[PDB]
Design a protein around this ligand. Structure first.
Ligand code: DEQ
Lengths: 150, 390, 150, 150, 48, 50, 50
């Protein structure tokens, strides 16, 4: 729900202040999107151990963790190994027993995706759609004529 | 000559090559939709499937996911060309594919689509290229900072021995602001809690709980049908319950009015910052444009700072020149042999330059070592002309 | 490097066995060195300011960078960063009939940012032309504005 | 949700639609203008590349089996066969450079025995560099393979 | 004397110029030892 | 706790950087033990209590 | 190296300061290093000459 100004100082800034005292580091950056999604990038010296370098950022992050909307806490916080560059981008389609661009994104993310990310040191997996979810489309006129709210 | 064949020869890092796999991204103007952008992604998918069969094995389009970031403005198509044997010509090859493809998108369209050889290299180090960034060091906001970036982008293009400079992607689209009069709210008898989790639950979505589906636990989301939240007039439809068991409209306590914000606020090193992706001039190369960009940012208002072969060789080669003489006197004591060999160096290197200055190559990484290998054979040749003759 | 990790990770199993006053406060795990070296004083001469104005600007421009910069275990601050301070008068609370629980709740309602969705929603109706983010409540700015809370 | 005065049972279905759909409808994939989802395996800072993707066995090997009606795998944007080619064009280079040397050896040394020593000299030296670079942590990189050739 | 000094790589031009020297610098010592042990011995053994 | 000790209520924005909001009281109403009585808490039955 | 880095320290924090704000250095390790090197490299050369 949050916009580019909300996330910019309730999640974004709270981390940036509480993201210091770390070994080897030239700079940090940030992108406070309007979709309600922020992603920060710390870049270390060349030849630095990426194993430990993750730890340090993801541990001192979790001191700011309770200075963070409970919407965002129950959502996905993550710390991973970056590589702006895919390689295997496995398409997955249907031919015979037809299904939609939604049915497939669910089965992909309910059988395959969970395994991949873990398997053979995959920094992070991308999902081209979304996993299923019990969706509810609240009608406002039908809320009013019984006297109710969301 | 040898020198002039080298100083004038331009310097790259590593050559961009056809990979049997390229891509091309999309970008629409201020606040376009999923239906408008999908129309463009179709046109791109088609040029590849119809006007490039003998070439494109398979596309893989994606509406709503840029490499700037994401949203309904952005897009991207993942191409996968047909193997190099069936695809023989120079036109068939990717340099030419992303040439008439880019030509088509800047011709029969009304937005922005490009195409690029996947920089085999790493992300960084285009060479004759940049990565500037404009920090706000003082108490200025996003609004005053923006204007300084407009004055930077302006002054570079107002007086470019040029430059090619543009912003990264802060388009700067409007936003439907909703002021809630707080005194009015409680007079009608509503908790501000109940009002907020109405607007956030209805228009934005809300993570309620988790349920079970076919083994795996997934999530439950609450929002509303699309048609009751597409425009600003649909705000009034939502009636919140008030303390005194009776409904109340939004319009009552609301205040509808538009504004001007930005849909992505970048922040470099703890402070606000908007990045600037320019390149070196078509004549100049980096170190020139870099120090000819710092002087333009220093002529900007207060509270606005900044922060961004190789110089490598000059030193590296220096120790090449020192260890030769040592080894040219570890078996060849005199101060006669250690100046013989010393000449075969540019005896051969003049031709190395000349072969690649004539054809379409440059001073890349493979050349830099094709030199030192050529010098190790120059050593060889000469050192025997000496060792035997002494 | 590793020795920090181990203590700061098994610490965060006790984390929810801890007052929520303390959770939203600063928990920290760092590299100790009872011994300063550079202790950079920062004073005023011309445009006079107090021992409070400086501690804020120090801790709103400089301090954040230092701790991060060149492996600084932890930074010390000789004063405090600014904060919207409120001095509750008890006699003026009594003659209107009120408590400090009502002032607190008034700030935890009026002084906040909220996640409002967007026009041209994530799943829209095919053929919508517009897509812009909604703004709602905003985090307050100045003294003035904290004086006009209801 | 409620039971209105006259025992009329208000249900969640009555006030709102309920369909099993995506958790996020922001992005959608069309493999050659045909609906589909999939996976975009991004690398890890430091991972083994043709080893992450080459492993497997897996990838998704035991995810190309129990699939229901119509579900099939398909490969766009793939790094793999570029590796397969650069190795093959350098190991081709290698052998051509031997054969071509074996002629120059004969052209000067009419002795067959003699066009045999240098032919059978560098085969060994090559392998040594594989044994030396493996011992120093280096790989069969794009670089180290032209280093065999150069 | 010209490869290993330029094998003193830097920054993002790390392995890059490094692997370049070393790979072949290794190949020098292996070509020398072979041209000091094998290529000699074999050349005696059976040349003419 | 809110009067004598202080209390971390929320966070507000000041000149870009997010800082904190604190609630306490003027010094002179919490310097000694006699000032405890000054604080009157509301009781269920809409009326004050010392 | 921590204290010698910089460039930084606070180098680009000795610039946009408003009216009157200045930097000043008490309790500082730095110049003790600068001295012990200089008195040993002096020692060194004296020991050669002598
Ligand atoms: C945290 C951590 C903790 C430790 N207590 C640790 C101890 C030793 C080394 C690394 C360590 N790390 C991190 C280390 C994982 C190291 C993977 C390394 C290289 C593999 C083979 C290279 N290699 C060469 C050339 C030569 C050797 N004589 C050799 C001897 C033993 C092992 C390796 C060798």
């Amino acid at each position: 729900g949050a916009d580019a100004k909300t996330v910019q100082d309730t999640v974004t800034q709270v981390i940036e202040q509480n993201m210091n005292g770390i070994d080897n580091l030239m700079y940090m950056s940030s992108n406070s999107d309007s979709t309600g999604t922020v992603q920060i990038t710390l870049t270390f010296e060349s030849g630095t151990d990426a194993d430990i370098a993750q730890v340090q950022v993801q541990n001192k992050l979790q001191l700011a963790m309770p200075l963070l909307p409970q919407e965002v806490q129950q959502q996905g916080v993550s710390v991973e190994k970056s590589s702006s560059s895919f390689l295997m981008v496995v398409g997955v389609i249907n031919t015979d027993g037809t299904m939609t661009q939604e049915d497939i994104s669910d089965y992909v993310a309910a059988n395959m995706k969970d395994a991949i990310s873990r398997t053979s040191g995959v920094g992070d997996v991308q999902l081209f759609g979304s996993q299923y979810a019990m969706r509810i489309w609240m009608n406002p006129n039908e809320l009013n004529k019984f006297q109710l709210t969301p | 000559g040898m020198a002039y064949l080298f100083v004038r020869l331009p310097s790259s890092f590593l050559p961009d090559e056809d990979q049997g796999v390229f891509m091309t991204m999309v970008q629409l103007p201020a606040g376009a939709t999923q239906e408008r952008t999908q129309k463009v992604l179709n046109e791109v998918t088609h040029y590849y499937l119809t006007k490039e069969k003998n070439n494109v094995e398979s596309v893989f389009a994606v509406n709503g996911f840029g490499f700037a970031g994401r949203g309904q403005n952005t897009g991207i198509a993942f191409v996968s060309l047909k193997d190099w044997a069936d695809r023989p010509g120079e036109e068939n090859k990717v340099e030419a594919i992303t040439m008439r493809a880019t030509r088509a998108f800047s011709q029969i369209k009304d937005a922005m689509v490009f195409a690029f050889n996947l920089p085999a290299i790493v992300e960084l180090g285009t060479a004759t290229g940049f990565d500037f960034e404009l920090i706000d060091q003082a108490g200025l906001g996003h609004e005053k900072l923006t204007q300084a970036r407009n004055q930077l982008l302006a002054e570079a293009a107002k007086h470019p021995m040029l430059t090619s400079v543009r912003p990264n992607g802060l388009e700067d689209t409007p936003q439907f602001k909703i002021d809630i009069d707080q005194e009015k709210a409680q007079a009608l008898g509503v908790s501000i809690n109940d009002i907020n989790t109405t607007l956030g639950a209805a228009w934005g979505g809300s993570y309620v709980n988790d349920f079970i589906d076919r083994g795996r636990v997934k999530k439950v989301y609450v929002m509303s049908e699309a048609k009751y939240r597409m425009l600003p007039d649909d705000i009034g439809d939502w009636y919140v319950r008030a303390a005194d068991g009776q409904m109340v409209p939004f319009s009552a306590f609301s205040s509808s009015r538009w504004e001007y914000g930005s849909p992505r606020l970048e922040r470099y090193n703890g402070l606000p910052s908007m990045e600037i992706l320019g390149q070196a001039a078509p004549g100049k190369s980096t170190g020139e444009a870099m120090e000819l960009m710092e002087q333009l940012a220093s002529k900007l208002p207060t509270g606005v700072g900044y922060d961004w072969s190789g110089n490598q060789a000059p030193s590296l080669y220096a120790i090449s020149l020192i260890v030769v003489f040592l080894c040219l006197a570890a078996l060849y004591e005199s101060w006669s042999i250690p100046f013989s060999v010393m000449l075969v160096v540019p005896l051969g290197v003049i031709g190395a330059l000349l072969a690649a200055t004539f054809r379409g190559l440059t001073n890349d990484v493979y050349f830099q070592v094709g030199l030192l290998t050529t010098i190790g054979l120059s050593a060889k040749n000469a050192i025997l002309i000496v060792e035997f003759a002494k | 490097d590793i020795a920090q990790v181990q203590v700061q990770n098994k610490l965060q199993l006790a984390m929810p066995l801890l007052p929520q006053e303390v959770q939203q406060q600063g928990v920290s795990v760092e590299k100790s060195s009872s011994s300063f070296l550079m202790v950079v004083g920062v004073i005023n001469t011309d445009g006079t300011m107090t021992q409070e104005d400086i501690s804020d600007y120090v801790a709103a421009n400089m301090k954040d960078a230092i701790s991060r910069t060149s492996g600084v275990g932890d930074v010390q601050l000789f004063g405090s960063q600014y904060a919207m301070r409120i001095w509750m008068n008890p006699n003026e609370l009594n003659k209107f009939q009120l408590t400090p629980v009502d002032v607190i709740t008034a700030i935890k309602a009026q002084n906040a940012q909220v996640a409002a969705g967007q026009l041209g929603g994530t799943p829209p109706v095919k053929g919508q032309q517009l897509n812009a983010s909604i703004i709602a409540q905003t985090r307050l700015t100045s003294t003035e504005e904290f004086g006009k809370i209801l | 949700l409620k039971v209105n005065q006259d025992g009329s049972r208000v249900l969640l279905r009555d006030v709102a639609k309920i369909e099993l759909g995506g958790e996020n409808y922001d992005i959608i994939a069309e493999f050659n203008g045909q609906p589909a989802s999939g996976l975009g395996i991004k690398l890890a800072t430091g991972a083994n590349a043709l080893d992450t993707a080459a492993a497997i066995r897996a990838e998704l090997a035991k995810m190309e089996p129990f699939f229901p009606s119509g579900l099939k795998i398909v490969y766009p944007y793939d790094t793999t066969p570029f590796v397969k080619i650069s190795i093959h064009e350098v190991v081709k280079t290698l052998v051509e450079a031997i054969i071509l040397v074996f002629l120059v050896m004969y052209l000067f040394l009419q002795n067959f025995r003699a066009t045999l020593i240098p032919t059978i000299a560098v085969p060994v030296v090559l392998l040594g560099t594989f044994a030396v670079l493996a011992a120093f942590g280096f790989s069969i990189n794009t670089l180290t393979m032209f280093g065999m050739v150069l | 004397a010209v490869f290993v000094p330029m094998a003193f790589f830097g920054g993002s031009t790390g392995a890059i110029y490094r692997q370049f020297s070393i790979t072949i610098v290794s190949a020098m010592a292996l070509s020398v030892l072979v041209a000091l042990i094998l290529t000699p011995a074999l050349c005696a053994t059976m040349l003419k």
